[PDB]
Amino acid sequence: AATLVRTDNFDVECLLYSSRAATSIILDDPTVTAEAKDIVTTYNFTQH
């Protein structure tokens, strides 16, 4: 005999609750850098 096993994946919407002021974010002023390539110049904004 045999035990056929199978998994199935479902599209689920799934709500969250959180108590207020539960976690704090210490963050940077966004830093700016520029890469001056020959045909484009790419500005990259980073933020920690």
Binding site: K37, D38, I39, V40
Partner: protein, 296 residues
């Protein structure tokens, strides 16, 4: 010197200039290396009238100087000569999905059934060579070498029996074909050195290697082994064994011989392998333009 202005000799139309505005960021080769060129020197049409031989077009496309289209303004047309190791965006023409990170070579246009809907202007077209991955570039060069090696075998209708099986190839769910390979004497020269290098692999192969097949068949068993046994049994025209030997302390000679074998394989690979012109980093979601940071 980097910038090259092309100004068309024949006049054009608004549909033509609309196609040129769509046609931006395409790699186009020029032979001239001047600052001002005309419509006679732009593209590959000034050479694709001489026999349309695929080997010949690939050779002269290697001799060409590649540029990138920029800023179609009026009748004038800017071409940037790309510098080495820099980043550029390329609009693509080859029928492929263009997975990122790979290398790209630059191949002659495979003439499809539909006429080119790009530019046909007073007995002059814009013959743009295609940009392909290096793997299918090597695959096409293999198919040319194989059709040469079969044109060696002179027959009637067996040539057709080989071509209709061989020529339609599929890579990344795309069907292409390359007919009209009249098998001129220029590819015969490249066939010569392939025959030489296989002859040297034959003569310089050590005792360990052919023995390694048989010992691995006696030891283990696998699918790879199963079809290797199929090939080794299906051909047996020579298969000579230099038998009486003991795997004796001749190991420096063994190293020398395996270095030679690797070097002849490097030679056949240098035949069958084309120069990579681009290295992809970032592809748009359309797979219509993609970026590279390379130049030979």
């Amino acid at each position: 010197m980097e910038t090259v202005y092309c100004t068309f000799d024949h006049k054009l139309s608004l549909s033509d200039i609309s196609t040129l505005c769509k046609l931006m960021n395409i790699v186009i080769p020029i032979p001239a290396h001047h600052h001002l060129i005309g419509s006679g020197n732009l593209g590959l049409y000034p050479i694709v009238s001489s026999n349309k031989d695929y080997v010949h077009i690939r050779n002269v496309l290697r001799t060409m100087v590649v540029t990138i289209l920029q800023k179609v303004e009026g009748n004038q047309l800017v071409l940037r000569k790309p510098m080495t190791g820099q980043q550029y965006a390329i609009k693509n023409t080859g029928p492929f999905p263009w997975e990122k990170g790979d290398t790209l070579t630059l191949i002659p246009p495979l003439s499809t059934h539909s006429e080119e809907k790009l530019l046909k202007l007073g007995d002059w077209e814009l013959t743009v060579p295609l940009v392909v991955p290096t793997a299918i570039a090597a695959e096409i060069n293999i198919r040319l070498l194989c059709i040469g090696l079969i044109a060696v075998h002179r027959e009637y209708n067996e040539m057709q029996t080989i071509i209709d099986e061989l020529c339609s190839i599929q890579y990344r769910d795309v069907l292409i074909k390359l007919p009209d390979i009249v098998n001129d004497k220029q590819s015969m020269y490249s066939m010569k050195t392939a025959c030489i290098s296989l002859s040297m692999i034959t003569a310089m192969a050590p005792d360990i290697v052919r023995t390694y097949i048989d010992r691995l068949t006696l030891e283990d068993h696998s699918m790879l082994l199963i079809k290797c046994q199929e090939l080794l049994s299906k051909r047996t025209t020579l298969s000579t064994q230099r038998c009486g030997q003991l795997h004796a302390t001749d190991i420096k000679d063994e190293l020398k011989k395996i270095k030679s074998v690797l070097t002849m394989i490097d030679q056949i690979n240098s035949l069958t392998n084309e120069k990579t012109y681009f290295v992809v980093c970032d592809v748009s979601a359309d797979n219509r333009m993609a970026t590279c940071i390379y130049k030979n």
